Amino acid sequence: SYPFTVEVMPVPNKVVKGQTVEIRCELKKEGDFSGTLYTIRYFQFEGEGSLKMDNGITFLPNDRYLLENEKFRLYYTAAGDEAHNFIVVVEDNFSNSYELEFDFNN
Numbered sequence: 001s002y003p004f005t006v007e008v009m010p011v012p013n014k015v016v017k018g019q020t021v022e023i024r025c026e027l028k029k030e031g032d033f034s035g036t037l038y039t040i041r042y043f044q045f046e047g048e049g050s051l052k053m054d055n056g057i058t059f060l061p062n063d064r065y066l067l068e069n070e071k072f073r074l075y076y077t078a079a080g081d082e083a084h085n086f087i088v089v090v091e092d093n094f095s096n097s098y099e100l101e102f103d104f105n106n
Contacts, residue, residue: 003034006090006098015049015078015104023074023102027067027090037093039064047084047104050077064091076102 009024029035041064042051051059054073059065067090078084083106091097 003031003096004029004098006100008100012104015084017078017080020075020077023076025072027070034094035092038067039091040067040088042086042088044086047082048079049084
């Protein structure tokens, strides 16, 4: 809510094994203050797959990566047909976070 949010464009409600989903995101700064440096991380709770940043880096769960651009894309490649659920968390250097949750095939 404050001091930032992350807007996400539409994503599919389903994926098949080997399909890559493009997730388009934009960091929105909601106030006058806070937020010079941002990181991104993810964690997967259901299903098998890999998540990559638009700079080609593959996320390792829970590791934090520098977010260089306000507008960025993520790429989720499913490794099976079972249901997928994962969260992506963006954090600033002032203890603020914003969580996105993705569900495919449920």
